[PDB]
Amino acid sequence: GPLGSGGLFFNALKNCKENFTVLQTIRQQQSTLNGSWVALLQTRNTLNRAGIRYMMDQNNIGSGSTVAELMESASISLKQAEKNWADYEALPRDPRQSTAAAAEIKRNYDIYHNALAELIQLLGAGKINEFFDQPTQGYQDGFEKQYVAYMEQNDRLHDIAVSDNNA
Amino acid sequence: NALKNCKENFTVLQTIRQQQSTLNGSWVALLQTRNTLNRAGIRYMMDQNNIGSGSTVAELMESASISLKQAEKNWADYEALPRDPRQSTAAAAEIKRNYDIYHNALAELIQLLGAGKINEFFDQPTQGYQDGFEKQYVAYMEQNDRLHDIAVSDN
């Protein structure tokens, strides 16, 4: 078109720099959310290991890490979840991301995160029965559903940026 | 060039992002498999004291199988992806070596369970196997962070 090389270059550089900023935004949200999700799963598994060790200790068998060591490890991983979740929330968002879906991920994150913190409290208090009975699976499932939707949203944004860069 | 520089910086983020999504997906599915197997352990022990609720040991065992296949699926996604030239090939081999150990360990637990080999099931030092993978996963992530931070700059 009746547009010069200088112009074509400026426009290409403008778009590239915009596209890059989108990928950066998305990559960071992805790594922080992922780090929070993994640390919650770790916490959950560690608490289950603690329950097993407890039930093993009843019949004076049971080895490996102690209930106390496992509880402390779960606390450390829950702190890792929280750290990653704070980083996630503070990141600048892309204007096109749904604020409604962001609110849902957060709602489910708090339910699941709080359930694990509660398990840690129940355990350290001796409320073993309460501990074994929490419907944790449902809480986790609710966060995961949102996590998937969020990633699907971000993959789309990713693709828009890629398509543009290719053209 | 300002342009070719940016067109390549964007390529780095793209390749890194996609490797991350799939590798993290595989890691999440492995973690879920391990947790589900520990749920089956609890359930079995509850069955021994004649209480014992929700999902059965058999149902959890099947669930763990499905989630382990999901790890394999995400792993194959990751394994087919293109690697950036600057990424460590030695690290890429060590993550694979550690995924295999951890994956195989989970495959074994499922086998042990569906054969009633309960002692061996509870015996397995799964934690060490997971830790081996995790350590490589962290280094890989740290490497990707560095490649991310250089792209934001060159931009």
The resolution, in angstroms to one decimal, equals: 2.0
* Angle, CA A85 vertex, CA A79 and CA A89 arms, to 5°: 150
B39–chain A nearest CA distance, Å = 7
For B138, nearest residue in chain A (alpha carbons):
A35
Whole-angstrom Cα distance, residue A155 to residue B8? 20
Determined by X-ray
- Cβ pair A31, A85 in contact under 8 A: no
Whole-angstrom Cα distance, residue B24 to residue B41? 26
| Residue among B35, B143, B139 nearest A38 (CA) | B35
Whole-angstrom Cα distance, residue A158 to residue A153? 9
Range A109-135 burial, b when 16+ CB lie within 10 A, else e: beebbebbbbbbebbeeeeeeebbeee
Three-class secondary structure assignment of A38-51: HHHHHHHHHHHHHH
Query: How many structural domains are present in chain B?
Result: 1
Domain that holds residue A56: 1-167
Positive or negative CA dihedral for B100, B103, B114, A48? Answer: positive
CATH of the domain at A29: 1.20.120.30
At residue A55, φ and ψ (nearest 5 deg) are: -65, -25
For B131, nearest residue in chain A (alpha carbons):
A42
User: Residue B13: which of A23, A45, A133 has the nearest Cβ?
Assistant: A23
| Residue among A107, A140, A134, A135 nearest A121 (CA) | A134
Token duo for residue B14 = 């793209």
Cα-to-chain-centroid distance, residue B97: 12
CB contact under 8 A, B122 and A56: yes
Number of residues in chain A: 167
Provide residues of B within 8 Å CB-CB of chain A. Answer: 2-3, 6-7, 9-10, 13-14, 16-17, 20-21, 24, 27-28, 31-32, 34-35, 38-39, 41-42, 45-46, 53, 122, 125, 127, 141, 145, 148, 151-152, 155
* Angle, CA A137 vertex, CA A134 and CA A142 arms, to 5°: 115
B152 contacts in chain A (CB < 8 Å): 24
